[PDB]
Amino acid sequence: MVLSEGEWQLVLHVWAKVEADVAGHGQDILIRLFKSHPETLEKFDRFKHLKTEAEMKASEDLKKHGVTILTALGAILKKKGHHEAELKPLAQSHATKHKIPIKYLEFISEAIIHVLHSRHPGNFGADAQGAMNKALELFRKDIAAKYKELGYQG
Ligand code: HEM
Known part of the structure; x- marks a missing residue:
């Protein structure tokens, strides 16, 4: 797939707002992921034990990782x-x-x-x-093609 320059502009224009507070957005996003799909929390051996959303909001480790991912x-x-x-x-x-x-x-x-x-x-x-969804689909599609080359799949 290929985004047009106009679509990229829409993605980088809202991303520049996220970058005013990377750690806060990272927290929000991971917490939303763990509440919606709690199975995903199991992949994190460092946080796995967190039971509530308050515990998650208070975890410095979770916040640091969110920054890692978003950067x-x-x-x-x-x-x-x-x-x-x-x-x-x-x-x-x-x-x-x-x-x-x-x-x-x-x-x-x-x-x-x-x-x-x-x-x-x-x-x-x-x-x-729509443009952000297209940029993340692109990302997932390229990553899935690398997964296949590396031997991972299902
Ligand atoms: C936008 C998507 C994602 C990005 C860009 C991303 C990026 C990263 C980065 C840069 C690291 C540290 C470097 C390395 O280990 O490769 C990391 C580690 C990790 N990521 Fe991802 N990640 C993403 C999605 C996920 C998802 C969806 C999960 C789990 C359900 C996940 C689980 C983890 C775990 C378990 C680690 C190691 C954490 C620790 O240090 O022990 N990642 N990820």
Whole structure:
């Protein structure tokens, strides 16, 4: 797939708002993912034990990881499709060490779109949400193609 420059602009225009508070967005997004799809929390051996949303909000580790994830995602979006080098080490650790199924990457994509919609309504209208969805589908499609080359699948 290929986004047009106008679609990338819509993605980078709402992303520049997220980057005013990376840690807060990371927290929101992971908590939304863990509430919606609690099975995903099991992949994290460091947080796995958190029982409630208050415990999650209070976990410094969870917040740090959210920052990790969003910074890596932001660097991929900024490439505007030319992200091959960034995806390699990412597809290798998620397919071989962590073992994150594409299904989960869809679940977090949904969590990202939910939070942007809540926090940025004026910059996340329908066309911008479509473009963000297209940029995350692109990301999942390229990662899934690397997963296959690396031997991971199902
Ligand atoms: C937008 C999607 C994602 C991005 C860009 C991303 C990025 C990262 C980054 C950069 C790291 C640290 C470097 C490395 O281990 O590769 C990481 C580690 C990790 N990621 Fe992902 N990730 C994403 C989605 C997920 C999802 C959906 C899950 C789980 C349901 C997950 C589980 C983890 C785990 C278990 C680790 C290691 C945590 C720890 O340090 O122990 N990732 N991810």
